[PDB]
Scaffold this active site. Sequence first.
Site, PDB file in Angstrom:
ATOM      1  N   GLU A 195      66.524  96.654 -42.571  1.00 24.53           N
ATOM      2  CA  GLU A 195      66.194  98.048 -42.863  1.00 24.53           C
ATOM      3  C   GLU A 195      65.145  98.577 -41.889  1.00 24.53           C
ATOM      4  OE1 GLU A 195      65.131  98.839 -46.850  1.00 24.53           O
ATOM      5  OE2 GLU A 195      67.060  98.246 -47.685  1.00 24.53           O
ATOM      6  N   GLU A 199      72.437  93.766 -49.610  1.00 25.35           N
ATOM      7  CA  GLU A 199      71.644  94.194 -50.757  1.00 25.35           C
ATOM      8  C   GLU A 199      72.422  95.229 -51.546  1.00 25.35           C
ATOM      9  OE1 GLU A 199      67.121  93.943 -48.796  1.00 25.35           O
ATOM     10  OE2 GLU A 199      67.670  95.612 -50.154  1.00 25.35           O
TER      11      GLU A 199
END
Lengths: 474, 474
Positions: B166, B374
């Site tokens: 991320e 995720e």
Amino acid sequence: HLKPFPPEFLWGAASAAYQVEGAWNEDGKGLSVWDVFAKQPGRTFKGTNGDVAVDHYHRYQEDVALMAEMGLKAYRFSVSWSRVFPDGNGAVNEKGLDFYDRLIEELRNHGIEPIVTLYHWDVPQALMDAYGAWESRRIIDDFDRYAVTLFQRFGDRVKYWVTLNEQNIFISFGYRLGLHPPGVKDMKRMYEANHIANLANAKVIQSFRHYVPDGKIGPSFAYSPMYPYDSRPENVLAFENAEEFQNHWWMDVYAWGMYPQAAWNYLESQGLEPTVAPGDWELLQAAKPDFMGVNYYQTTTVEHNPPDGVGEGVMNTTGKKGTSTSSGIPGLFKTVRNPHVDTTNWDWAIDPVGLRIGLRRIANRYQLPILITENGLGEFDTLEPGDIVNDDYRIDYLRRHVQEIQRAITDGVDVLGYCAWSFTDLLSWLNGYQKRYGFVYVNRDDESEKDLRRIKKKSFYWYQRVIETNGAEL
Amino acid sequence: HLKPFPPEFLWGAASAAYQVEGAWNEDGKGLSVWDVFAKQPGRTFKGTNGDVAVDHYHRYQEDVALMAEMGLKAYRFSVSWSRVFPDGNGAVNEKGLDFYDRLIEELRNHGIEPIVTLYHWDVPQALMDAYGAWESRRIIDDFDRYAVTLFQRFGDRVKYWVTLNEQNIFISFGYRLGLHPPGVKDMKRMYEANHIANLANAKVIQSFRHYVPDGKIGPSFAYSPMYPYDSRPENVLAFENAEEFQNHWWMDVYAWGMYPQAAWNYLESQGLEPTVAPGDWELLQAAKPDFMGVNYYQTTTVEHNPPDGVGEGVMNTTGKKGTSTSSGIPGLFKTVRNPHVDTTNWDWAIDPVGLRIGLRRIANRYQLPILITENGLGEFDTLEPGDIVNDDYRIDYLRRHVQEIQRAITDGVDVLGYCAWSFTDLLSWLNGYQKRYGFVYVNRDDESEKDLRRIKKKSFYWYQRVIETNGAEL
């Protein structure tokens, strides 16, 4: 804060040979599939056909003079395959070539850039008789020989070339909807002919690299950018399916040489995917174009379509507003009227911001410069006393679309030019003459053929002013 | 007729080192930027920090046994750089590598595939002190030394690797919103650090091709796919801006090695585009990943934002529903509530179809396999007497997202695996412990570590059944 139009911007106007030329059987011209198709009773409105059209084959000198008066930087036309090879694959017709030679010299002597379109839907009937035209791999090398003929004869005087014009249209209308030659309604055939047309596009771009190394070439796609109706996840997914099936299906092949995978798998599950031979992917991936041509008129908004829902729908060629019905593909998407834009009386969306959106999507996905090959508004025109055609509707449509082009250029999109549709009024493929697109009114209607005299519309003087100020005054 | 999940589909669960490990100063570990930052007053909810977390560092054997009982196919975790290089770039701390070796051996002895994340936001403080960490090119070779250390020590036993987790979050929260270290609010510095992180990602993918020739590697992007509010052309243009600026800005560099042009030009007009050195484009373009890692929680709906309009918005940090407000970029777009989906108490949209849409967009644009690194639901859990946690809300969210993954696979998206966030409850970076994500409840709160005992939630046994049936029973 707007960027200006670039100094070399190709301010243009466009036509198509069958729609403009006439002289359908002169100087050795063979028959095309539209010569045959339009003469079948009931295919065209009131039987109108391209025998005479607006007689541009005999009146081009008058036509180019009006272009020069307007100050066109560019003129986009198509070459009629059946004037150059009456049999498609036989002996060349020097008189056919001679006409386009005279046309290009007329353009060049008045400082107009010629943009030559290789194919606009008029394959010779002979090729269709011999082997089904676009359904056979034989058309690949016959189209190549044709293309190469034009490249050798005009490549030193023509920088900008367009290969196939609106391939999604003449494939879909010709093999799925049955509205164009060959008048077929068979999706398996539609995608086989489409695949062969992709290979033809790629072969002539690869020839062009050899025969015209200093020129620029691209296909021209009839691009209606898809919108989701709202932020319902099911409608956004319908938009994903629609943009990939209606638009990426062609543009990804043009740009990357690959079909999109989800669309491919959907066709595979239906038994509809095209036949692939050794050599195909390598050819399609090796034909990068210099630009993407774009014919734009409207955007399309779509919504969720259940597996049993809407299929093919009702088109509106009468001009009575509201008569269109949703078309779609069950399971994937169906269209719906966009409540945030107005439409014409043919239910076409009026959406100039949609043009900026579509230009932005091509730059963002392919990083290609764009040549706008077709944009226009079709409407009835009244000739008023004093040779006055007050087509303020047409000016208003062209103004807003040119304004959005400038915003896209300011966003960073490389727009090479803009060819409004069309220069003179011309014959529509199926609905005759009364839905006019030209800057120049042509004196004829559906019944009375009159004298075909050219009359300058109000929009002619608007666009003359656009060109001389390079778009600064709109 | 859905495709089955493929035979070696990686049914996984995930964590991150700072959120789970504790042992913040043991066995020679150096300070990370999060050790320092979370101890500054006001930075984290109720001053929670990672000193202990849920003490996975000492209790990893118990946790891995619970993964085996669940029958986990893969476990995704991050390596704490400050355990391996306490000062970031000096001598290796063997006890640091020995923990991850013990952990990997525990996983492999129980049949679990390790998925190693190289970077999950915890660069050693010493690199921040020496040269400002990600804002300096010096980090490219320092990150590379660290990655190769791990590749050589563990490449024989780890096939799947994630580079930067991320990047869009730790860079934008760290340099634009000032909510993460180094706590900076400066868009120009943000895009400079972001460019350096792109080069560091590319450098270690390159190294990976030498040191782990048989492994698979990719970045893990925090992907929120954008929707336009409706078919209003201005809202669709907002969607074009939002998807390119929020998503293509990162994924195009990952996949193609190039920034998108409209976004770049907008940054250039503001003096915010990053500094590019000779050789940058060549490095970035030559670092193709094996997969796109996708961290997915929600979609984001956008609408037109006038140049005087919304900028930073209010972020829901408390868990009180309805407290978020619009965020956007003036002149480009702003967020707006999607009225066609529900939202959690933290105002995150619940949009499992969005995950199908997001997977479809990545396939359609990049043609890459996807590893979902995720996905999960963060919510309050009640421990009922008998050590029972009925988290049907979590089961329902996970169930609907796994269902849409299988529809995406049936469309033709190559999905390699699915890592639910998280295996055990863990520390949230800013929101403390009460927003729980685990299959395994951990007995602690924001005030007390209690005994940190592990308690299987109802969703543990649901996911165990999912894995046993390879997803045929959801």
